[PDB]
Coordinates of C-alpha atoms and ligand atoms in Angstrom, one line a residue:
Chain A
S3 CA 16.1 -56.2 -56.4
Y4 CA 19.1 -56.3 -53.3
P5 CA 19.2 -59.4 -51.0
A6 CA 17.3 -60.0 -47.8
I7 CA 17.5 -57.1 -45.0
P8 CA 15.9 -58.0 -42.0
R9 CA 12.9 -54.8 -40.8
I10 CA 13.7 -53.9 -38.1
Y11 CA 11.6 -51.0 -36.2
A12 CA 12.5 -47.8 -36.3
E13 CA 10.8 -44.8 -34.9
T14 CA 11.5 -41.2 -34.1
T15 CA 10.2 -37.7 -32.2
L16 CA 12.7 -35.3 -34.9
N17 CA 11.3 -36.4 -37.8
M18 CA 14.8 -35.5 -39.1
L19 CA 17.4 -38.7 -40.6
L20 CA 14.3 -41.4 -39.7
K21 CA 12.2 -38.5 -41.9
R22 CA 12.2 -41.7 -44.7
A23 CA 14.2 -44.5 -43.0
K24 CA 11.2 -44.5 -40.3
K25 CA 9.6 -46.9 -43.4
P26 CA 11.6 -50.1 -44.1
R27 CA 12.4 -49.5 -47.6
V28 CA 15.3 -47.8 -50.1
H29 CA 13.7 -44.2 -51.0
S30 CA 14.7 -43.6 -54.3
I31 CA 16.3 -40.9 -55.9
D32 CA 12.7 -39.1 -56.7
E33 CA 11.0 -39.3 -53.4
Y34 CA 14.0 -37.8 -51.5
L35 CA 13.7 -35.0 -54.0
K36 CA 10.3 -35.1 -53.8
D37 CA 11.3 -34.0 -49.3
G38 CA 13.2 -30.9 -50.8
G39 CA 16.5 -33.6 -51.5
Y40 CA 19.6 -32.3 -52.1
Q41 CA 18.1 -28.5 -51.8
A42 CA 20.2 -28.7 -48.9
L43 CA 23.6 -29.2 -51.8
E44 CA 22.6 -26.5 -54.2
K45 CA 22.8 -24.3 -50.8
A46 CA 26.3 -25.5 -50.1
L47 CA 27.6 -25.7 -53.5
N48 CA 26.7 -21.0 -53.6
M49 CA 28.7 -20.9 -50.0
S50 CA 32.6 -21.1 -49.5
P51 CA 33.7 -23.3 -47.5
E52 CA 35.5 -22.1 -45.1
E53 CA 31.1 -21.5 -43.6
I54 CA 30.5 -24.8 -44.2
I55 CA 33.0 -26.0 -42.1
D56 CA 32.0 -22.3 -39.8
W57 CA 28.4 -23.5 -39.6
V58 CA 28.8 -27.9 -38.7
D59 CA 31.3 -26.3 -36.0
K60 CA 28.8 -23.9 -34.6
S61 CA 26.1 -27.0 -34.7
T62 CA 27.7 -27.7 -31.9
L63 CA 28.0 -31.7 -34.0
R64 CA 30.0 -34.8 -33.3
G65 CA 31.4 -37.4 -34.2
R66 CA 28.9 -40.4 -34.3
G67 CA 31.8 -43.3 -34.7
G68 CA 32.9 -43.7 -30.6
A69 CA 35.0 -40.9 -30.2
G70 CA 32.8 -37.9 -31.0
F71 CA 35.7 -35.2 -32.4
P72 CA 33.8 -31.9 -33.3
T73 CA 33.0 -32.9 -37.2
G74 CA 33.4 -29.5 -37.7
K75 CA 37.4 -29.3 -36.3
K76 CA 38.0 -32.3 -37.4
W77 CA 36.7 -30.6 -40.7
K78 CA 39.6 -27.1 -39.2
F79 CA 42.4 -30.0 -38.7
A80 CA 42.8 -31.7 -42.4
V81 CA 42.3 -27.7 -44.5
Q82 CA 45.7 -26.6 -42.5
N83 CA 47.6 -29.5 -44.9
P84 CA 47.6 -28.8 -48.3
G85 CA 45.4 -30.6 -51.0
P86 CA 44.5 -32.9 -52.6
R87 CA 41.9 -34.4 -49.6
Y88 CA 40.4 -38.0 -49.7
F89 CA 36.7 -37.8 -47.2
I90 CA 36.1 -41.5 -46.1
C91 CA 32.0 -42.4 -44.9
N92 CA 32.5 -45.2 -42.2
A93 CA 30.4 -47.1 -42.8
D94 CA 32.1 -50.1 -41.4
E95 CA 29.5 -51.0 -38.8
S96 CA 30.0 -54.4 -36.6
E97 CA 30.9 -53.0 -32.3
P98 CA 27.9 -55.8 -31.1
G99 CA 24.6 -53.7 -30.5
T100 CA 25.6 -51.3 -33.0
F101 CA 22.2 -51.7 -36.6
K102 CA 22.2 -47.5 -36.3
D103 CA 24.0 -46.3 -39.0
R104 CA 22.2 -49.1 -41.5
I105 CA 19.0 -48.4 -41.5
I106 CA 19.9 -44.7 -43.1
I107 CA 22.6 -46.3 -45.9
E108 CA 20.0 -48.9 -46.6
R109 CA 16.5 -47.2 -46.5
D110 CA 18.1 -43.0 -47.0
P111 CA 21.1 -43.4 -49.4
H112 CA 20.6 -40.2 -50.2
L113 CA 20.4 -37.8 -47.3
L114 CA 23.8 -40.0 -46.5
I115 CA 24.6 -39.2 -50.3
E116 CA 23.9 -35.2 -49.8
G117 CA 26.1 -35.4 -47.2
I118 CA 29.9 -36.8 -48.3
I119 CA 28.6 -33.9 -51.6
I120 CA 29.2 -31.0 -48.4
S121 CA 31.8 -32.7 -47.2
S122 CA 34.2 -33.3 -50.0
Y123 CA 33.2 -29.7 -50.5
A124 CA 34.3 -28.2 -47.2
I125 CA 37.1 -29.7 -46.6
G126 CA 38.4 -29.9 -51.1
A127 CA 38.3 -33.3 -52.1
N128 CA 37.8 -34.1 -55.3
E129 CA 37.7 -38.8 -54.5
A130 CA 35.2 -39.8 -51.2
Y131 CA 34.9 -42.8 -49.9
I132 CA 31.8 -45.3 -49.4
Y133 CA 34.3 -47.6 -46.6
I134 CA 31.6 -51.1 -45.7
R135 CA 31.4 -53.8 -44.1
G136 CA 31.0 -57.0 -46.2
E137 CA 28.2 -58.2 -44.5
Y138 CA 26.1 -55.0 -45.7
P139 CA 25.9 -56.6 -49.6
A140 CA 22.3 -55.2 -49.3
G141 CA 23.9 -52.0 -48.1
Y142 CA 26.8 -51.8 -50.9
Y143 CA 24.4 -52.5 -53.9
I144 CA 21.6 -50.1 -52.8
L145 CA 24.8 -47.1 -52.3
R146 CA 25.8 -48.6 -55.7
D147 CA 22.2 -47.5 -56.7
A148 CA 22.1 -44.6 -55.5
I149 CA 25.2 -43.3 -56.8
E150 CA 24.5 -43.4 -60.3
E151 CA 21.0 -42.2 -59.5
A152 CA 22.2 -38.8 -57.5
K153 CA 26.0 -38.6 -61.0
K154 CA 22.3 -38.5 -63.8
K155 CA 20.9 -36.1 -62.2
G156 CA 24.1 -34.0 -61.8
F157 CA 25.4 -34.3 -58.3
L158 CA 28.4 -36.2 -59.1
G159 CA 30.2 -36.3 -61.0
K160 CA 32.7 -32.9 -62.7
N161 CA 31.8 -29.4 -62.6
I162 CA 28.9 -30.6 -59.7
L163 CA 25.4 -27.5 -60.6
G164 CA 28.4 -25.0 -62.9
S165 CA 30.2 -24.6 -59.8
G166 CA 32.9 -26.0 -60.6
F167 CA 33.7 -29.0 -58.0
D168 CA 34.2 -32.4 -58.8
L169 CA 33.5 -35.3 -56.9
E170 CA 33.3 -39.0 -57.4
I171 CA 32.5 -41.4 -54.5
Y172 CA 33.9 -45.3 -54.6
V173 CA 32.6 -48.2 -52.7
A174 CA 34.4 -50.2 -51.2
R175 CA 33.7 -53.0 -49.6
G176 CA 35.0 -55.3 -46.3
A177 CA 35.8 -58.5 -45.2
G178 CA 35.1 -59.5 -41.9
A179 CA 36.7 -57.7 -39.7
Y180 CA 36.2 -55.5 -37.0
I181 CA 39.1 -53.7 -37.0
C182 CA 38.9 -52.8 -39.9
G183 CA 36.6 -49.2 -38.9
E184 CA 39.4 -48.3 -37.2
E185 CA 40.4 -44.8 -39.3
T186 CA 43.5 -46.3 -39.9
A187 CA 42.9 -49.2 -40.3
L188 CA 40.3 -49.3 -42.3
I189 CA 42.6 -46.7 -45.2
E190 CA 45.3 -49.8 -44.8
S191 CA 42.1 -51.8 -46.0
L192 CA 41.5 -49.5 -49.3
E193 CA 44.1 -49.4 -50.2
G194 CA 44.0 -53.0 -50.6
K195 CA 46.0 -54.0 -47.7
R196 CA 45.4 -55.3 -44.3
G197 CA 43.2 -53.8 -41.9
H198 CA 46.2 -53.0 -39.1
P199 CA 46.0 -49.8 -37.5
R200 CA 49.0 -47.5 -37.7
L201 CA 50.3 -46.1 -35.1
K202 CA 49.9 -42.0 -34.3
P203 CA 51.1 -39.9 -34.5
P204 CA 50.1 -39.3 -37.9
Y205 CA 46.6 -38.3 -37.3
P206 CA 44.5 -39.2 -40.9
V207 CA 43.8 -35.5 -41.1
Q208 CA 47.1 -34.5 -41.7
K209 CA 49.0 -38.1 -43.7
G210 CA 45.8 -40.1 -43.8
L211 CA 44.9 -42.5 -47.1
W212 CA 48.0 -43.0 -49.6
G213 CA 49.8 -40.1 -46.5
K214 CA 47.5 -36.8 -47.8
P215 CA 44.7 -34.8 -45.9
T216 CA 42.1 -37.6 -44.7
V217 CA 38.7 -37.3 -43.9
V218 CA 36.9 -40.4 -41.8
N219 CA 33.5 -39.8 -40.4
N220 CA 30.9 -41.9 -39.4
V221 CA 27.5 -42.6 -41.1
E222 CA 24.8 -40.6 -38.5
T223 CA 27.4 -37.8 -38.2
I224 CA 27.8 -37.4 -41.9
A225 CA 23.3 -37.7 -42.5
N226 CA 23.3 -34.0 -40.5
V227 CA 25.6 -32.9 -42.3
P228 CA 22.2 -31.3 -44.7
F229 CA 20.0 -30.8 -41.7
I230 CA 23.1 -28.4 -40.5
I231 CA 23.1 -26.4 -44.0
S232 CA 18.9 -26.4 -44.7
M233 CA 18.0 -25.4 -41.1
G234 CA 21.2 -22.9 -41.0
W235 CA 23.2 -23.7 -37.6
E236 CA 21.3 -21.6 -35.3
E237 CA 17.7 -23.6 -35.6
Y238 CA 19.9 -27.2 -35.6
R239 CA 21.7 -26.1 -32.1
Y240 CA 17.8 -25.5 -30.5
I241 CA 17.4 -29.1 -31.3
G242 CA 17.8 -30.9 -27.7
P243 CA 20.3 -30.2 -24.4
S244 CA 22.7 -26.9 -26.2
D245 CA 25.5 -28.2 -24.6
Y246 CA 24.3 -31.9 -26.5
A247 CA 22.5 -30.5 -29.6
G248 CA 20.9 -32.6 -32.6
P249 CA 18.8 -35.5 -33.3
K250 CA 21.1 -38.9 -32.2
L251 CA 20.3 -42.5 -33.1
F252 CA 19.8 -45.0 -30.6
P253 CA 19.7 -49.2 -31.3
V254 CA 18.1 -50.7 -29.0
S255 CA 17.8 -54.2 -28.4
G256 CA 17.6 -57.3 -25.5
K257 CA 15.0 -58.5 -23.5
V258 CA 12.6 -54.8 -24.8
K259 CA 9.5 -55.7 -25.9
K260 CA 10.1 -52.9 -29.1
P261 CA 13.6 -53.9 -30.2
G262 CA 14.9 -51.4 -32.9
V263 CA 16.3 -47.8 -33.8
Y264 CA 15.2 -44.8 -31.4
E265 CA 15.9 -40.9 -33.4
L266 CA 15.6 -38.7 -30.3
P267 CA 16.6 -35.7 -28.3
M268 CA 20.5 -36.7 -26.0
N269 CA 18.7 -35.0 -23.0
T270 CA 16.5 -38.7 -22.9
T271 CA 17.3 -41.3 -20.2
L272 CA 18.3 -44.3 -21.0
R273 CA 15.5 -45.1 -18.8
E274 CA 13.3 -43.4 -20.4
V275 CA 14.9 -45.2 -24.0
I276 CA 13.4 -48.4 -22.0
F277 CA 10.4 -47.8 -20.8
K278 CA 9.4 -44.6 -22.6
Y279 CA 10.1 -46.2 -25.6
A280 CA 11.1 -49.5 -26.2
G281 CA 7.7 -50.5 -24.4
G282 CA 9.6 -51.2 -21.1
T283 CA 11.2 -55.6 -20.9
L284 CA 9.9 -58.7 -22.2
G285 CA 7.9 -60.4 -19.7
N286 CA 7.5 -56.9 -17.3
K287 CA 11.0 -58.2 -16.0
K288 CA 13.5 -56.7 -13.7
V289 CA 16.3 -54.7 -15.5
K290 CA 19.5 -56.3 -14.3
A291 CA 22.1 -54.4 -16.9
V292 CA 22.7 -52.2 -19.9
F293 CA 25.4 -53.2 -22.3
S294 CA 27.0 -50.6 -23.3
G295 CA 28.3 -52.5 -27.0
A296 CA 31.1 -54.0 -25.7
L297 CA 32.5 -51.1 -23.9
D298 CA 30.7 -50.1 -20.9
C299 CA 28.2 -52.3 -18.8
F300 CA 25.5 -50.1 -16.6
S301 CA 23.2 -51.4 -13.9
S302 CA 19.1 -51.0 -12.8
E303 CA 20.9 -48.9 -10.3
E304 CA 22.8 -46.6 -12.9
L305 CA 19.4 -45.7 -15.2
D306 CA 18.7 -42.8 -14.3
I307 CA 21.9 -41.0 -16.4
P308 CA 21.0 -38.7 -20.3
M309 CA 21.7 -40.5 -23.0
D310 CA 25.0 -38.4 -24.4
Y311 CA 28.7 -38.4 -24.8
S312 CA 28.9 -35.8 -20.7
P313 CA 31.4 -38.1 -18.7
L314 CA 28.1 -38.8 -16.2
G315 CA 26.5 -40.0 -20.0
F316 CA 25.3 -42.8 -21.5
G317 CA 28.7 -42.0 -23.4
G318 CA 29.6 -44.8 -27.0
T319 CA 27.3 -44.6 -29.6
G320 CA 24.4 -44.8 -27.8
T321 CA 23.6 -48.8 -28.3
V322 CA 21.7 -49.6 -25.7
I323 CA 21.3 -53.6 -25.0
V324 CA 19.2 -55.4 -21.7
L325 CA 20.0 -57.6 -19.9
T326 CA 17.4 -58.9 -17.9
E327 CA 17.2 -60.1 -14.1
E328 CA 17.3 -64.4 -16.1
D329 CA 20.4 -63.0 -18.1
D330 CA 23.2 -64.7 -16.1
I331 CA 26.3 -61.6 -16.7
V332 CA 29.8 -64.2 -16.3
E333 CA 27.1 -66.1 -19.6
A334 CA 26.9 -62.8 -21.5
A335 CA 30.8 -61.3 -19.9
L336 CA 32.1 -64.7 -22.0
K337 CA 30.2 -63.3 -25.5
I338 CA 32.3 -60.1 -24.9
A339 CA 35.5 -61.5 -24.5
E340 CA 34.9 -63.8 -27.0
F341 CA 34.3 -60.5 -29.6
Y342 CA 37.5 -59.3 -28.5
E343 CA 39.6 -63.1 -28.9
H344 CA 37.7 -63.1 -32.6
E345 CA 38.9 -59.6 -32.7
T346 CA 42.4 -58.4 -32.1
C347 CA 44.5 -57.8 -35.0
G348 CA 47.5 -59.0 -33.3
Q349 CA 49.5 -56.1 -33.8
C350 CA 50.8 -55.5 -30.6
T351 CA 51.5 -58.3 -27.2
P352 CA 49.6 -57.7 -24.6
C353 CA 46.1 -56.6 -26.9
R354 CA 47.6 -60.0 -29.3
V355 CA 47.9 -62.8 -26.0
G356 CA 45.5 -60.6 -23.5
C357 CA 42.6 -61.2 -25.9
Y358 CA 43.0 -64.6 -26.6
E359 CA 43.8 -65.2 -22.4
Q360 CA 40.8 -62.9 -21.0
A361 CA 37.9 -65.6 -23.4
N362 CA 40.1 -68.3 -22.9
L363 CA 40.4 -68.6 -19.4
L364 CA 37.1 -66.8 -18.7
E365 CA 36.1 -69.8 -20.8
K366 CA 37.4 -72.3 -18.1
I367 CA 35.9 -70.7 -15.3
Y368 CA 32.8 -70.1 -17.1
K369 CA 32.6 -74.1 -17.6
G370 CA 33.3 -74.4 -13.9
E371 CA 37.3 -75.6 -15.2
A372 CA 38.7 -72.8 -13.6
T373 CA 42.1 -73.5 -11.2
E374 CA 42.3 -70.7 -8.6
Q375 CA 45.8 -69.3 -11.2
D376 CA 42.8 -70.0 -13.6
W377 CA 41.2 -67.1 -12.1
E378 CA 44.0 -65.5 -10.9
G379 CA 45.3 -65.5 -14.9
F380 CA 41.6 -64.1 -15.4
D381 CA 41.6 -61.2 -13.1
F382 CA 45.6 -60.0 -13.9
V383 CA 45.2 -60.7 -17.7
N384 CA 41.6 -58.6 -17.8
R385 CA 43.7 -55.2 -16.2
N386 CA 46.6 -56.2 -18.9
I387 CA 45.4 -55.7 -21.8
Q388 CA 46.3 -51.5 -22.6
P389 CA 49.9 -51.3 -22.4
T390 CA 51.6 -50.9 -25.3
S391 CA 48.5 -51.4 -27.7
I392 CA 48.4 -48.5 -31.1
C393 CA 44.7 -48.5 -31.0
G394 CA 41.7 -48.2 -29.9
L395 CA 40.3 -52.1 -29.3
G396 CA 43.2 -52.7 -26.6
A397 CA 43.0 -50.2 -24.0
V398 CA 38.7 -51.1 -23.7
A399 CA 39.3 -55.2 -24.5
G400 CA 39.2 -55.6 -20.4
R401 CA 36.7 -52.4 -20.1
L402 CA 32.8 -54.0 -19.9
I403 CA 34.1 -57.4 -18.3
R404 CA 36.2 -54.5 -15.3
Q405 CA 32.5 -53.4 -15.0
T406 CA 29.9 -56.3 -14.7
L407 CA 33.1 -58.3 -12.0
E408 CA 33.1 -54.2 -10.1
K409 CA 29.0 -54.1 -10.8
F410 CA 27.9 -57.7 -9.7
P411 CA 30.7 -60.0 -7.8
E412 CA 28.0 -61.9 -6.2
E413 CA 27.1 -63.7 -9.4
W414 CA 31.2 -63.9 -10.3
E415 CA 32.2 -65.7 -6.9
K416 CA 28.9 -68.6 -7.9
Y417 CA 31.0 -69.1 -10.5
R418 CA 34.3 -69.6 -7.4
Chain B
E5 CA 47.2 -73.8 -66.0
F6 CA 44.7 -72.0 -64.2
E7 CA 43.1 -69.7 -65.8
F8 CA 39.5 -67.8 -64.7
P9 CA 36.3 -67.8 -66.9
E10 CA 36.1 -65.0 -69.4
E11 CA 32.4 -64.4 -67.2
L12 CA 34.8 -63.8 -64.2
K13 CA 38.0 -62.4 -65.6
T14 CA 35.5 -59.6 -67.1
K15 CA 33.9 -58.8 -63.9
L16 CA 37.0 -59.1 -61.9
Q17 CA 38.7 -56.5 -64.4
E18 CA 35.8 -54.3 -64.0
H19 CA 36.3 -53.8 -59.6
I20 CA 40.2 -53.3 -60.8
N21 CA 39.2 -50.5 -63.2
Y22 CA 36.8 -49.4 -60.7
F23 CA 39.1 -48.0 -58.5
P24 CA 42.4 -44.8 -59.2
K25 CA 44.6 -47.2 -58.2
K26 CA 44.0 -51.6 -59.4
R27 CA 45.4 -52.9 -56.0
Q28 CA 42.5 -50.8 -54.3
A29 CA 40.4 -53.9 -55.7
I30 CA 41.7 -57.3 -54.5
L31 CA 39.4 -57.8 -51.6
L32 CA 35.8 -57.0 -54.4
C33 CA 37.9 -59.0 -56.4
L34 CA 38.0 -61.8 -53.4
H35 CA 35.0 -61.4 -52.3
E36 CA 33.5 -62.6 -56.5
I37 CA 36.1 -65.6 -56.8
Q38 CA 34.4 -66.8 -53.1
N39 CA 30.9 -66.2 -54.9
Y40 CA 31.5 -67.6 -58.5
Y41 CA 32.9 -71.3 -56.4
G42 CA 32.0 -71.0 -53.8
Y43 CA 35.3 -70.2 -51.8
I44 CA 38.8 -68.9 -52.3
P45 CA 40.6 -71.8 -54.7
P46 CA 44.1 -71.3 -53.6
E47 CA 44.7 -71.3 -57.6
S48 CA 43.2 -68.6 -57.7
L49 CA 45.4 -66.3 -56.1
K50 CA 48.6 -66.3 -58.7
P51 CA 46.1 -64.2 -61.6
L52 CA 44.4 -62.4 -59.1
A53 CA 47.9 -61.2 -58.1
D54 CA 49.3 -60.3 -61.3
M55 CA 45.8 -59.2 -63.0
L56 CA 45.9 -56.6 -59.5
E57 CA 49.6 -56.4 -60.0
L58 CA 50.3 -57.0 -56.2
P59 CA 53.0 -60.1 -55.3
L60 CA 51.1 -63.6 -54.9
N61 CA 52.6 -62.8 -50.5
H62 CA 50.8 -59.7 -50.3
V63 CA 47.0 -61.2 -51.9
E64 CA 48.2 -64.6 -49.6
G65 CA 48.7 -63.0 -46.5
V66 CA 44.8 -60.6 -47.1
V67 CA 42.4 -63.9 -48.0
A68 CA 44.6 -65.5 -45.0
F69 CA 43.8 -62.6 -42.6
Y70 CA 39.6 -61.7 -43.9
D71 CA 37.6 -63.3 -42.0
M72 CA 34.3 -63.9 -44.9
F73 CA 36.3 -65.4 -47.5
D74 CA 37.0 -69.7 -46.9
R75 CA 40.2 -70.7 -48.4
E76 CA 39.4 -74.6 -48.0
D77 CA 35.8 -75.6 -48.2
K78 CA 33.2 -74.8 -50.8
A79 CA 29.8 -74.4 -50.1
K80 CA 27.3 -73.4 -52.6
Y81 CA 25.5 -72.0 -49.5
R82 CA 26.9 -69.9 -46.8
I83 CA 24.2 -70.0 -43.7
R84 CA 26.7 -67.3 -41.2
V85 CA 24.5 -67.1 -37.9
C86 CA 25.5 -64.9 -35.3
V87 CA 27.3 -66.4 -32.1
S88 CA 27.4 -62.4 -30.2
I89 CA 25.9 -61.0 -27.2
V90 CA 22.3 -59.8 -28.2
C91 CA 22.1 -63.2 -30.7
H92 CA 23.0 -65.1 -27.6
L93 CA 20.4 -63.7 -25.4
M94 CA 17.7 -64.2 -27.5
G95 CA 18.9 -67.8 -28.8
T96 CA 21.6 -68.1 -31.0
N97 CA 21.8 -71.9 -30.1
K98 CA 17.6 -72.9 -30.3
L99 CA 18.9 -71.4 -33.7
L100 CA 21.7 -73.6 -34.3
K101 CA 19.6 -76.5 -32.5
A102 CA 17.0 -75.8 -35.2
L103 CA 20.3 -75.8 -38.0
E104 CA 21.4 -79.3 -37.2
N105 CA 17.7 -80.8 -37.1
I106 CA 17.1 -79.5 -41.3
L107 CA 20.5 -79.9 -42.5
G108 CA 22.2 -82.5 -40.1
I109 CA 25.5 -80.1 -39.6
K110 CA 27.6 -78.3 -36.9
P111 CA 29.3 -74.4 -37.3
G112 CA 32.5 -75.5 -39.6
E113 CA 30.7 -78.6 -40.8
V114 CA 29.0 -78.2 -44.5
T115 CA 26.6 -81.0 -46.0
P116 CA 27.6 -84.4 -47.9
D117 CA 26.3 -82.5 -51.3
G118 CA 29.1 -79.3 -50.5
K119 CA 24.7 -76.9 -50.5
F120 CA 24.8 -75.9 -47.4
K121 CA 27.8 -74.8 -44.5
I122 CA 27.4 -73.2 -41.4
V123 CA 29.9 -70.5 -40.7
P124 CA 29.9 -68.8 -36.6
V125 CA 30.4 -65.3 -37.4
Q126 CA 30.5 -61.7 -34.9
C127 CA 28.1 -59.6 -35.0
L128 CA 26.2 -58.6 -38.0
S129 CA 24.6 -55.7 -36.9
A130 CA 20.9 -56.7 -37.4
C131 CA 20.8 -57.0 -33.5
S132 CA 17.3 -55.6 -32.8
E133 CA 16.3 -59.1 -34.8
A134 CA 18.2 -61.5 -32.9
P135 CA 19.0 -64.1 -33.3
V136 CA 20.6 -63.2 -37.1
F137 CA 21.8 -65.8 -39.4
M138 CA 22.7 -64.6 -43.5
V139 CA 21.9 -67.2 -46.3
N140 CA 24.6 -65.8 -48.8
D141 CA 23.8 -62.2 -48.9
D142 CA 20.6 -62.5 -47.9
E143 CA 19.6 -61.6 -44.0
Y144 CA 16.9 -62.7 -41.6
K145 CA 15.8 -62.8 -38.2
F146 CA 15.3 -66.7 -36.1
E147 CA 11.6 -67.5 -35.5
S148 CA 11.2 -71.3 -35.5
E149 CA 13.0 -74.2 -36.4
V150 CA 9.1 -74.2 -38.9
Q151 CA 10.0 -70.7 -40.7
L152 CA 13.5 -72.1 -40.9
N153 CA 12.5 -74.8 -42.6
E154 CA 10.6 -72.4 -45.4
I155 CA 13.5 -69.6 -45.6
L156 CA 16.3 -72.6 -46.5
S157 CA 14.2 -74.7 -48.8
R158 CA 14.7 -71.1 -51.1
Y159 CA 18.1 -72.5 -51.5
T160 CA 18.3 -75.3 -53.7
Ligands
FMN501 C1 38.4 -50.9 -32.5 C2 37.8 -50.1 -33.6 C3 36.7 -50.7 -34.2 C4 35.5 -48.8 -35.2 N1 34.6 -49.1 -36.0 C5 33.7 -48.7 -36.0 C6 32.2 -48.5 -36.9 O1 32.6 -49.4 -37.1 N2 32.0 -46.9 -37.8 C7 33.1 -45.9 -37.2 O2 33.0 -44.9 -37.5 N3 34.4 -46.0 -36.3 C8 33.9 -46.5 -35.4 N4 35.1 -46.7 -34.8 C9 36.2 -45.1 -34.9 C10 36.6 -44.3 -35.7 O3 37.8 -44.7 -36.1 C11 36.5 -42.8 -35.7 O4 36.2 -43.0 -34.9 C12 35.3 -42.7 -37.0 O5 34.9 -44.0 -38.2 C13 35.2 -41.1 -36.7 O6 34.6 -40.0 -37.9 P1 33.1 -39.7 -36.3 O7 34.1 -38.5 -35.5 O8 32.5 -39.1 -37.3 O9 32.5 -40.7 -35.1 C14 36.5 -48.1 -34.5 C15 37.4 -47.6 -33.7 C16 37.8 -48.5 -33.8 C17 39.8 -48.4 -32.3
SF4_502 S1 45.3 -52.5 -29.5 FE1 45.1 -54.7 -30.8 S2 44.4 -55.0 -32.1 FE2 44.9 -52.2 -32.1 S3 46.5 -52.4 -32.7 FE3 47.3 -53.7 -31.2 S4 46.5 -55.8 -31.9 FE4 46.0 -55.0 -33.0
FES503 S1 24.8 -59.5 -31.9 FE1 23.8 -60.4 -33.4 S2 23.8 -58.9 -34.9 FE2 24.7 -57.5 -33.6
NA504 NA1 34.3 -54.6 -41.7

């Protein structure tokens, strides 16, 4: 028995990452094995670590955590440095609108565990971690049980399947900070400290957990690793566009008929995600904007863009929050400002004071209590959260809000 | 003078022995303490620091940093209400109004019996099921006051 989880709708056109996770229930090891589960691990243990890295590289798989670094290349960088090495599964998923990772953790934990074992073997890590946000208690108990199921079927522990490879997967819990998804802050939290990002360089692949070479990968990235080994890199590269190949999970929310997670190729357009798959809008109202998580804002004129990591593409993590004609953009921008205000770790002064002031002044603007000085101050602060910042949060805290100012000036001017 | 009840001490020692290094268990221990008492008693920090082999200052800093931990209000059930973008768009205010009609409390408040506390939180990452809330570890989609009332009646 696990804590209650809402039943998120999940649909797939590829039947890969959502093969089992399209069903809202825990798929235990017996059901997993019946589908050919852990057979990719068996094949991997018969291959050299260098060969697995090459396949993952040739698959063109890129990070699903937001930065899109090529996964195979990240592994090459880490194995350049001497051991012991560490493998970390980033299950901190806390960005507004993003709920793709949890459905893998909660419904197909073994797809994630298998991915972790293959990845750990590829980089020579004998100790792996799952760092899962504190607000996923069910996901935590499901992973602990699944790890024990894997241990009993001999997929974990010492000398896994007579290969001489040892691995233990430890599950760590977060405790309320979005910043703990930042790979260096996650490592600090795993070391039993406050989740404060470290100045980069050094990068985790060189000096991470206990100053040792550390590979941090997102849940969704790791969930592709069993498919790459099972299918082979070539067959995997055939899925979707050849330049942005493989399956991709799209968490869709807001004013859509069918909100949920969609497994689609990355040549799908934003308009197709909304209208062809998510069933269009609630009450057939006009789409006003799409928020790419708390990162970007796309207008109704930008829906024909592809859902890939190209510069003109959707980018981010494929997070789709739909706002229709009746949704106030200034009220929406305030919710984004409030997010960054609550999440800055405060190490950097323009980030600490800029995230606070952007939200404080925007609330004044929204409530009709802003002076002309507050209006000018708001514009200044929004353009000045980034200076001296040592992590991605300070660099993006004003991005989406700046885009609503540029794309919806008529709406903002109504608040003047 | 402060002592952890044996049943808690045992669970705490298990977390401390779980990771390769003792100090890595700090967050698991603090979740355990809060689940046992319904908050983090200020007096529990010194015995925990000793067990983790960390200075009291380090533990206090960690408790202050992580938002899930509450050192002030003892509450049997924590009602975490998402106040972020998607739940806002889909009905956070309807959820809060329903909670006030049922329990008589607003965000940050605790009922007179110490049973329920409304905690406003950022995105719980169940956005397709907005407006979202948790009741301790259980997570739900808010539908209506009638539906919410039935959910809350399960926490006695
Ligand atoms: C403020 C901030 C929050 C982040 N949150 C997450 C998160 O919840 N999950 C995640 O996997 N990556 C998150 N990232 C990105 C990670 O730092 C990192 O790029 C990623 O985990 C690497 O894995 P990938 O290459 O598989 O994408 C965040 C980054 C920043 C700057
Ligand atoms: S940029 Fe912001 S969130 Fe990142 S380390 Fe600096 S203060 Fe913390
Ligand atoms: S915005 Fe409420 S759960 Fe994501
Ligand atoms: Na966290």
